[PDB]
Amino acid sequence: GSSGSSGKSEKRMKLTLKGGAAVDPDSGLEHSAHVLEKGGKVFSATLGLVDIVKGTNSYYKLQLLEDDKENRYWIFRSWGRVGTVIGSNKLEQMPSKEDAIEHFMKLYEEKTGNAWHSKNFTKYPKKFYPLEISGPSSG
């Protein structure tokens, strides 16, 4: 036996099929949703904090995933010590894209303490900072 076939035909009518950053597999939206990109930017920030006294090392990750089905979004939040028994994540669906951005903007604003879209970064006590820094501004 044997057979084959193929085709190609579509009408682009208000559709933005594209991505940017990679999504976490633990989110289960890596094969469904994708990193929420805005203003030619990516909603993928990697913060890290480690006490010198407590000798405890922490790491906070933030990623705003966007549903590429109809119109939905989730809010991924990872936290826990560095290489330990700890390790937990949070996944919640957002009502509106904004509600997702706001949270993602406030969340990253709570850890670091500074607004996501803010200039000048003050290394506060406990406040988390950006680990892997790349691109213009800051660093």
Curated annotation (Swiss-Prot):
The modification ADP-ribosylserine is found at residue 9. Changing residue 81 to A: Decreased poly-ADP-ribosyltransferase activity upon binding to damaged DNA. It is found in: Cytoplasm. Disulfide bonds: none annotated. The modification N6-(ADP-ribosyl)lysine is found at residue 11. There is a cross-link at residue 18 (Glycyl lysine isopeptide (Lys-Gly) (interchain with G-Cter in SUMO2)). The modification PolyADP-ribosyl glutamic acid is found at residue 10. Residues 32-128 form the WGR domain. The modification Phosphothreonine is found at residue 84. Interacts (when auto-poly-ADP-ribosylated) with AIFM1. Promotes AIFM1-mediated apoptosis. This form, which translocates into the cytoplasm following cleavage by caspase-3 (CASP3) and caspase-7 (CASP7) in response to apoptosis, is auto-poly-ADP-ribosylated and serves as a poly-ADP-ribose carrier to induce AIFM1-mediated apoptosis. This is Poly [ADP-ribose] polymerase 1, processed C-terminus. It comes from Homo sapiens (Human). The gene is PARP1. The chain holds residues 518 to 643 of 1014 of the full protein.
